């Protein structure tokens, strides 16, 4: 059998007995075949419905207990066996099971002892009976329990970012059934940025919270803090959903969605105007975004007809998410909490944003069609259909009841997207996976991302360039090195994926679905330098981490034995020139221009050998993979020599060699050289323009302002005529016009 064989039988008996009572009485015999087709999240709901009408069947109840045993949910499996046993006492083997499971999970309660006594009298002195007798004894005493707790706490003092240890603390709290302390630490720990990124931790967070909700302790204590803990569950669900989608398979991700949707429906009813309501707002968006990402995962593997329909469906999901407004940040109790919530908001808008674009670039106003056709409530049922099995009750599912009202159907603005990204750099702990995705998403757009601003948000007060550039010691790491690094990681990543699809769209993949986009070498480096800077390394591993970084520095700075293809160096050079040429301050201009000249000075020797059609000495285990896809050709050499000569002139101007800079700039009639010529002619005029000074000099001063006006006009004249020149502008066109207005009124 398969999935088709069992889900097609749904319509077989549905057409023979359509009333609700008989539809549910077939649940056990429906569930009979899903247990065989390896569907346990589905089989669970089928049998549970038959139990809703046939609540006195010992066979059905045991079958659910046996299914919860495979799910390893001890508390749920035991109770199911209990019902089957109390209905039918002749089920001896179940009395053993109950005693077997009660003694394995926890002995603190005498209930495990009681069921063991009965199990003994049903199987006099059987081999299992003693086995259970030894198991019950194993558990430690009061002094023993306190002893373990101190280890974890003393262990957590110096290792607060250890996933396993914090998990054990929640399990120890749960073993003493002081769940309030379990959630309390669970709540104070959702502020940890590292733990929030841990898949296994968030899974434990979902359970320890749910356990507390149903726990007797939650009701007795009070109903005031009930809302507070409920927020964290939603937060945990969001984090858990992001991670499950990337690592886990299609089946597991879909199942988590149902728990997410169940939580949303249970939360929306309370409402209010506090942190929980604001949290519900932001989490609502995440749901669709991840749901859209989930949709695209299925379609990737599937055929073309499903791909378009699913991508159409996903496009709507991301749209719903993007529309959701920025959550009310002021409304939260604390700075940490509110800052977190906004960080996630930026993540939602950023990820969904780029996806919305990459899906809309496929066709003309593709977004408009998506809304006009599927914004209809008919889409709401087509969405629920593709994601979930229709058998589940469509009433308590948040997805089926949401009011899809007035979808903005407005494509995102790039400027808004940049500030969303920058604000969400710390969303996923700056994993090189995160940044390499963003960097690639901007690779198809006409505006480039503020990478240097990303790094400033991550490594605060890290100087743009280090004074002690002579050595490669990793205490001299600079934001330039990182910026230079990320550039290669993305330039490398793009080429690797380009090669992959050629053998077999690359932009369209969502962030969770795609696999590692960087080499494990690159990832190891970034994780090292990250742990080092933020001061979350290990005294023992310091020397190792320190050396791992040092190894690659000589490559990021194009020093001895750099594994750098000439094209990547050129790419670094121009990308830094134009990055620096748009900066306002001199410190940054100088730095970025210096490095650009540096890489240029290293390439030109290579280009000359390539200019005569010779061979480049290929590298030894390069840090940035070489590719013949972008190997430099003679057709482009003369351009680089020219574009490089500009970078030389620019730095010459910044250093003071104006005479040599102008002589070079004037040699080449380029749009960029005008903006430079003008900007420096304007400064020589403005300073001397109004102070009391020799009249002849004043006329010479004015003469420069006359040259400034002319060069700006050449820019706009040549700019309006041709689009290719508009893209060469070192600054925006409107910025050029802005100066001109002030230049002439002077």
């Amino acid at each position, epitope marked *: 059998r398969s999935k088709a064989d069992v889900e097609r039988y749904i319509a077989s008996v549905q057409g023979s007995t359509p009333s609700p009572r008989q539809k549910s009485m077939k649940g056990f015999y429906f569930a009979k075949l899903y247990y065989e087709a390896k569907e346990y999240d589905l089989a669970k709901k089928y049998i549970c419905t038959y139990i809703n009408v046939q609540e006195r069947d010992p066979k059905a109840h045991r079958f659910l207990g046996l299914l919860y045993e495979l799910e390893e949910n001890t508390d749920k499996a035991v109770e199911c066996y209990r019902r089957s046993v109390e209905l039918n006492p002749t089920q001896k083997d179940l009395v053993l099971k109950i005693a077997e499971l009660l003694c394995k999970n926890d002995v603190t309660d005498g209930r495990a002892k009681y069921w063991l006594e009965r199990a003994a009298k049903l199987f006099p002195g059987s081999p299992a009976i003693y086995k259970l007798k030894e198991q019950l004894l194993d558990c430690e005493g009061e002094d023993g329990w306190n002893k373990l707790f101190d280890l974890i706490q003393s262990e957590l003092y110096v290792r607060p970012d250890d996933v396993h240890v914090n998990i054990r603390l929640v399990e120890v709290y749960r073993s003493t059934k002081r769940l309030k302390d379990a959630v309390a630490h669970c709540h104070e720990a959702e502020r940890n940025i590292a733990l929030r990124s841990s898949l296994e931790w968030n899974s434990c967070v979902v359970q320890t919270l749910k356990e507390y909700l149903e726990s007797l302790q939650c009701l007795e204590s009070d109903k005031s803090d009930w809302r507070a803990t409920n927020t964290d569950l939603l937060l945990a669900y969001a984090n858990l959903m992001l991670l499950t989608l990337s690592t886990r398979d299609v089946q597991e991700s879909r199942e988590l969605l149902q728990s997410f949707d169940s939580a949303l429906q249970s939360v929306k009813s309370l409402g209010g105007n506090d942190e929980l309501s604001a949290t519900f707002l932001e989490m609502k968006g995440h749901f669709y975004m991840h749901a859209g990402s989930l949709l695209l995962k299925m379609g990737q593997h599937s055929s073309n007809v499903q791909w378009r329909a699913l991508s159409e469906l996903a496009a709507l999901c991301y749209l719903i998410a993007f529309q959701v407004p920025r959550p009310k940040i002021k409304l939260i109790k604390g700075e940490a909490g509110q800052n977190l919530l906004e960080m996630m908001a930026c993540d939602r808008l950023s990820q969904s944003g780029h996806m919305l674009l990459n899906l809309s670039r496929g066709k003309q106003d593709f977004l408009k069609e998506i809304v006009e056709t599927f914004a209809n409530k008919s889409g709401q049922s087509a969405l629920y259909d593709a994601l979930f099995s229709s058998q589940s009750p469509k009433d308590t599912s948040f997805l089926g009841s949401d009011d899809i009202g007035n979808i903005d159907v407005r494509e995102p603005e790039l400027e808004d997207l940049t500030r969303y990204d920058v604000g969400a750099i710390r969303a996923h702990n700056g994993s090189l996976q995160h940044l390499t995705w963003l960097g690639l998403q901007w690779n198809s757009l006409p505006a480039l991302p503020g990478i240097r601003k990303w790094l400033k948000q991550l490594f*605060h*007060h890290l100087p743009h360039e280090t004074s002690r550039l002579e050595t490669n010691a990793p*205490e001299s790491i600079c934001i330039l090195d990182l910026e230079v690094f990320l550039l290669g990681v993305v330039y490398t990543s793009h080429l690797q994926l380009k090669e992959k699809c050629n053998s077999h769209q690359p932009l369209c993949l969502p962030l969770p679905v795609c696999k590692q986009l960087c080499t494990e070498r690159q990832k190891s480096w970034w994780d090292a330098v990250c742990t*080092l*800077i933020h*001061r979350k390394a290990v*005294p*023992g591993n310091v020397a190792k981490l*320190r050396l791992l970084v040092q190894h690659e520095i000589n490559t990021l700075r194009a020093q001895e034995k750099h594994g750098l293809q000439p094209a990547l160096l050129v790419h670094w050079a121009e990308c830094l020139q134009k990055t620096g040429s748009g900066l306002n301050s001199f410190y940054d201009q100088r730095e970025y221009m210096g490095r650009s000249v540096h890489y240029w000075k290293k390439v030109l020797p290579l280009l000359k050998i390539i200019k005569k059609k010779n061979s480049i000495p290929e590298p030894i285990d390069p840090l940035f993979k070489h590719f013949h896809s972008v190997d430099i050709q003679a057709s482009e050499i003369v351009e680089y020599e020219e574009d490089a000569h500009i970078t030389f002139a620019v730095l010459d101007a910044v250093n003071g060699n104006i005479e040599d800079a102008v002589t070079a700039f004037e040699s080449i009639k380029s749009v960029v050289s005008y903006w430079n010529l003008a900007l420096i002619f304007h400064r020589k005029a403005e300073d001397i323009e109004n102070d009391a000074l020799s009249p002849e000099e004043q006329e010479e001063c004015k003469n420069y302002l006359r040259k400034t006006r002319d060069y700006l006009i050449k820019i706009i004249d040549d700019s309006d005529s041709n689009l290719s020149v508009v893209k060469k502008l070192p600054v925006p066109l409107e910025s050029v016009k802005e100066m001109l207005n002030s230049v002439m009124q002077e």
Partner: antibody
Amino acid sequence: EVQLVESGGGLVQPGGSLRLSCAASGFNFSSSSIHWVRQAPGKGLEWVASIYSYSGYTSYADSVKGRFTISADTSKNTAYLQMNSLRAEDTAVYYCARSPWRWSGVSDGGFYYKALDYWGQGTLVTVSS
Amino acid sequence: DIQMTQSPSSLSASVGDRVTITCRASQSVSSAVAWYQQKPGKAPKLLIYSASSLYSGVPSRFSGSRSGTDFTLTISSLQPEDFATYYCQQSSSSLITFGQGTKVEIKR
């Protein structure tokens, strides 16, 4: 261009709490180990706390163990000395200082710092009811 | 616990003298000792690190030396600006301890 500024001092009642701030600038705060050294009036130098350079494992003198807590923030490029259960004995001038990773060695049984190069002006803390 | 016993507690000398201060480590300690100069009320400044290595910027008349478990600061020719209190410091495993200090009073 390189300096350390102490703040967060002032007077407090015994059994109270204070928090000192050691603001650093000019050297990479990540690769530096941070220390605190108090000095009562007319008395000598007493080491009270340390922070290993690249990770930040704490270590305190038994005279203040468990009461004080020293921390380092990369985003704010600043270290702090949280003081609780302050006693009249804690009245002293509190200095902070750094020790680069070049001078920070880790050994079996604990770590050592070769010397304290950069020192601060020193912020006063008086503890008297 | 390791202890650094500094001697003498108070010293009196005049300009040009060759002055000596000594600190003894109770247990056998490796060469991870330092020396500091603290003028009244100001901050302590580093003179010698790693027992006998001079801190960049310190005058050449200062010199450190060790003999067994006894560490010694040596000033070849005392100057007027060196009349201040000095301290010796050991760095053992996850612990730092200072000597009682030595005041250098001008003799008259």
